[PDB]
Amino acid sequence: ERHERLREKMRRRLESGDKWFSLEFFPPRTAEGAVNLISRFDRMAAGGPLYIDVTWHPAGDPGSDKETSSMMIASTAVNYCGLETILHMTCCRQRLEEITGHLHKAKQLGLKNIMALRGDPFNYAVDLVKHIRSEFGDYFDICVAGYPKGHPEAGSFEADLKHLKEKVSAGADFIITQLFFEADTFFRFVKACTDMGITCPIVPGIFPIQGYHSLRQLVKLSKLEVPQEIKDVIEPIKDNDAAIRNYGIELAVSLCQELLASGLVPGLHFYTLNREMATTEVLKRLGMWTEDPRRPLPWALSAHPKRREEDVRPIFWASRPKSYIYRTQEWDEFPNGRWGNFGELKDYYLFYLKSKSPKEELLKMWGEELTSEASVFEVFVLYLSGEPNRNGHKVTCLPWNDEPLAAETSLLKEELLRVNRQGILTINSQPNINGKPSSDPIVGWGPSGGYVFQKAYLEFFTSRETAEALLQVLKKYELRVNYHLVNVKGENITNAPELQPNAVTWGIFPGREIIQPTVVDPVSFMFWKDEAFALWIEQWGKLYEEESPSRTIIQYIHDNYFLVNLVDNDFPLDNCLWQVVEDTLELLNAENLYFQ
Amino acid sequence: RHERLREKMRRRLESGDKWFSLEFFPPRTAEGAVNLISRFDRMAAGGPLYIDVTWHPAGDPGSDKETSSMMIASTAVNYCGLETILHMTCCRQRLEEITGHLHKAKQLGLKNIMALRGDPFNYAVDLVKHIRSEFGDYFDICVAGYPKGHPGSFEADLKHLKEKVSADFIITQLFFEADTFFRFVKACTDMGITCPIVPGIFPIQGYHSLRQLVKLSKLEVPQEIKDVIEPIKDNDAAIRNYGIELAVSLCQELLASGGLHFYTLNREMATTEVLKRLGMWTEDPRRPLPWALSAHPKRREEDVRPIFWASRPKSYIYRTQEWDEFPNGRWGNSSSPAFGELKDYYLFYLKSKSPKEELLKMWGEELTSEASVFEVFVLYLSGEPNRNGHKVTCLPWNDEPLAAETSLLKEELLRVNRQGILTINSQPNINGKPSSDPIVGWGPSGGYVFQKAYLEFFTSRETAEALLQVLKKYELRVNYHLVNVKGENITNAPELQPNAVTWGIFPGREIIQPTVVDPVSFMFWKDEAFALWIEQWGKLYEEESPSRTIIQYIHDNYFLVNLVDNDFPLDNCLWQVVEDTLELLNAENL
Ligand SMILES: Cc1cc2nc3c(=O)[nH]c(=O)nc-3n(C[C@H](O)[C@H](O)[C@H](O)COP(=O)(O)OP(=O)(O)OC[C@H]3O[C@@H](n4cnc5c(N)ncnc54)[C@H](O)[C@@H]3O)c2cc1C
Ligand SMILES: Cc1cc2nc3c(=O)[nH]c(=O)nc-3n(C[C@H](O)[C@H](O)[C@H](O)COP(=O)(O)OP(=O)(O)OC[C@H]3O[C@@H](n4cnc5c(N)ncnc54)[C@H](O)[C@@H]3O)c2cc1C
Ligand SMILES: Nc1ncnc2c1ncn2[C@@H]1O[C@H](CSCC[C@H](N)C(=O)O)[C@@H](O)[C@H]1O
Ligand SMILES: Nc1ncnc2c1ncn2[C@@H]1O[C@H](CSCC[C@H](N)C(=O)O)[C@@H](O)[C@H]1O
């Protein structure tokens, strides 16, 4: 589409006449708050914001690597959520060495939009604008604050304008305003700027009333008075937050509609206070929320500036995209179009092998004690089925899979239960698909109006005895199935032709060239299996004492099982991988007449 | 298999393989230069291994004249995709001169040079020397051999021949006696040269052929064979039939009991009949892509092209020859350079195969209205003769016969061409047939091939206007591009990016999408597409004539247009697009 500077996107929708919206957020003070905020990021991205924001305050150690910092929240938005992101930054109580350090760190992590702020008790925001330009040149897009009714500390309202003028002239690209109550206020302010010679975009900020706290909040945020009109309607319902928010919505809709109708406003900046409901309904009533949102690819896109060309990945990190980005982040270029057109996969320190969950919860799910390998088989079975284990606990994750199953796995639940129950322990799979509509709600992706294709895939740990039987069976399948077996020692075998990669998901779209975003690559597989095997020990086996029978079992599996991936090349035909497994079970059991 | 001639030599014959060979002489006349390129294209059908062009300083072989040895062989590689050996001789020529010739050989893409003494500071020997110093290895230089031998005595000459192995192989003279050079085989193993031997073969095709055998071979045909040609009448056709039969038998035990290098003499018939008779002539192979791979080394990675030059492959090579790198994978991510212009429509290797007298009979020695022109398009597609008994072999745009896939939509094409939709390119839609399909297959076996339906055609300004209306209700399904000779165009191609219209899915591999429809490339193509009206058809007629006027009027006013149906799993809707356009051009009102 368009992978261009924010201010390039903005003047495009300008000329185009398309109105847009943005969302402002604040870094939470606890991890659980941080975790939930990122979930909201993902839910509200579906609306199509031009951009989102993360505020900045020095009481919150905002430049640090703490998970709750403005810097790490912004960085998550860009690198994991794929969003165009604006990092706010204030220069009250800061020296040159501090600010320059923060700017370098944001550049490394992929940020590329700064809002230059003074902050409240380097003396004025303009010093930060002029400084970003001299020290980083034009690398960053920069925006700056404006005040429709004048800044409080300013003497003349007229003088505040002249100041604004100078910081915009120092090197800013657009203005975001403080909240207001009457469209007419924005309008005069705009004509004051227009008459001053300020020529950049001025985005109005909108603050939705979302309950009773909103009144005290917006006066703290802005130092404006709340009008008796709003006050008189709200004080009768002072204790009914639900009813208040429908009035906030009516007010916001009416205001924005009077702004949008202006034509002198290109977009809308919402102060969300990290809450979803009210802001989404205001935008939907306006017609600015995306009607039929599509996932762009089967995996989520990064917004890092270096990584704009990537549109194909190996399938092996599908449940661990954070590990993939980490192991590839030193690369100079990324594959575009075909994988096989090659920098090495980087190695890893342990914090990526650790689980999120505490030890006591994992033990309740995976088992305080194991009595044999079959104890392990049932944990995978229960991960797939959803039923409770014999102590009453659902299995919500595996060392390889910390989220729930995608929708596509419902196409093959019973087949998967069958093989896990016989000791083929799966960690990745996908059904075959023969050109379903690209808008399909279970497997669709990419532009509307085209056709999506998948070859059936299966990946799994199994004992040496089973693998050895699998290889004999694979001879009848030599031309149809591609196969790769490897153990923790690195003994491996594969019929990948000249060790080339195999496309397994792809899409044909009207008016465009082909997109093949997922492949099975034998070279990548040999780096992936180093993690896959290590996760047995780092998340499961260490839950037990070194001399325990439960550890002996997990360690045994790690030292002996094979990792296996299988692809059925004949996507127009029924998935043949289930019959491959049944043929293996027969071969293993060929001397027992009770299974024939 | 895309490797050098040394690797391309030892790898086949060890693993139960034997190969062809064909030697040609550079022609003397322009008309002969075009005849020879055509004969290059035909006999390339015979799945040969390597081809060969002779050399002699009297014919200024290093020059740029179309008759020069080095141009013929440069054309063989660049425009015909044959792997070729350029002969080179050292007879009396300065140290600098041979160097300049060697510079041009590899530079023009030539890889297999053959060093030979020239019959009037070096003699036979100093061939590999000159080259080797600036040659490299496994580039495959080859040296001459005369089995029954001729000037010296075999003590030094026969010593000098297997001594010059240092040179991947050698070529042997005509063997008049069956297995006469067979004594050369084991004796050549005794010579100690670790390279293989390549044997000759020379046919009889006329009376004045016989004498030609004495002049080039400097040997005497056996008395027995002369006892059968003297009775062979002045009917060179007679003498010929006995020639191929003399041949097929000789090497028959020879191919096994012992590659066959056959001295064509720039003639096809005999050397071919012996080929399929010897069991070494492939007449229907699988195609690796919908279009033919260039033999040049710099186009190693080329695997996607615009659909617009499908009938004019050699023009595409000509207009792309200045490019440093070639598009791989997708077209649009290769940031292509500009196409070079085609200003010379009379290049011997791009001209039409038909002389002007033939084109007049098939296209009309006079034209009376625009409909005169429609009918010629219709006859080309149908195969039926015109009113004067002549089938239409070709069009300005299409100098060969239809591909097999067009039979899937012959009747549909006849309907639109009759109505003034003058087509020059098409393909059917294909929803996943086996890659080994005989009509539309290509690529590795055991996969699936796909096509979006395509249509490209000239039509009048009035028809184009009405087509635009009809397309308003196909906007989501049909991609379109229209343009006239002046350059006014309209397309709904999104962001002007290209559209993939043929692709395949193969076991254990990544996707291959060799054909696109690209709105940028289409602006360069249209210049060539329109110029063919005047250069091929219009200039058949006197400049002031009513015929030329009609062609001139079409060139100056019609639009060229291409259409794609994106919904490959559904029946082709391009035929309904046209019916609706022709409906809208009629005055019902109820
Ligand atoms: C959209 C928006 C986002 C915000 N985000 C944050 C955030 O993330 N974190 C945070 O802590 N605060 C934030 N703020 C608060 C903002 O910092 C305060 O309003 C602050 O008091 C003023 O900062 P400023 O960048 O507007 O400063 P300035 O532009 O420097 O204005 C401050 C005052 O100085 C005066 N002045 C300007 N230039 C000169 C000059 N050359 N000489 C003399 N006087 C001058 C102006 O008239 C004005 O009265 C935000 C405000 C807005 C509107
Ligand atoms: C397949 C083939 C293709 C040909 N193509 C051409 C062509 O394109 N143009 C053309 O003009 N002719 C061509 N000829 C003919 C060739 O040029 C003549 O045979 C020429 O007179 C020398 O051939 P040669 O390459 O064997 O020479 P050389 O290899 O130089 O001569 C070897 C012969 O001469 C003797 N000899 C010569 N010098 C020495 C020496 N210093 N020490 C020892 N022995 C020596 C050897 O004993 C041996 O008999 C071709 C011949 C063949 C078989
Ligand atoms: N333990 C397990 N066994 C089998 N499949 C699993 C699994 N855990 C997760 N999966 C499945 O593995 C898939 C990873 S996404 C697979 C590739 C994707 N269809 C694409 O186009 O790239 C999801 O479908 C997920 O539900
Ligand atoms: N005058 C004409 N009108 C319509 N089609 C024509 C034509 N002359 C030639 N053709 C057809 O146009 C096609 C050019 S080859 C088409 C490309 C092919 N689909 C691919 O995958 O690359 C041939 O099929 C040929 O037979």
Author numbering:
A (entry chain A): 40 to 160, 172 to 391, 397 to 651
B (entry chain B): 41 to 160, 172 to 202, 205 to 219, 222 to 313, 317 to 648
Verbatim from the authors:
MTHFR catalyzes the physiologically irreversible reduction of 5,10-methylene-tetrahydrofolate (CH2-THF) to 5-methyl-tetrahydrofolate (CH3-THF), a reaction requiring FAD as a cofactor and NADPH as an electron donor. Since the product CH3-THF is exclusively used by methionine synthase, and only the demethylated form (THF) may be recycled back to the folate cycle, MTHFR commits THF-bound one-carbon units to the methionine cycle. Eukaryotic MTHFR orthologs additionally possess a C-terminal regulatory domain that is connected to the catalytic domain by a linker sequence. The MTHFR catalytic domain adopts a TIM-barrel structure evolutionarily conserved across all kingdoms.
We determined the 2.5 Å resolution structure of HsMTHFR38–644 in complex with FAD and SAH by multiple-wavelength anomalous dispersion using the selenomethionine (SeMet) derivatized protein. The HsMTHFR38–644 protomer folds into two globular domains to form an overall elongated molecule. The C-terminal regulatory domain (aa 363–644) makes up a novel fold of two five-stranded β-sheets arranged side-by-side in the core, flanked by a number of α-helices. The two domains do not contact each other directly, but instead are connected by an extended linker region encompassing aa 338–362, with its amino acid sequence rich in Arg (n = 4), Pro, Glu and Leu. In fact, this is reflected in our structure whereby the catalytic domain of one dimer subunit (chain A) is ordered, while that of the other dimer subunit (chain B) is highly disordered, to the extent that only main chain atoms of the amino acid 40–58, 129–134 and 155–342 in chain B could be modelled. In our structure, SAH is bound in an extended conformation within the part of the regulatory domain that faces the catalytic domain.
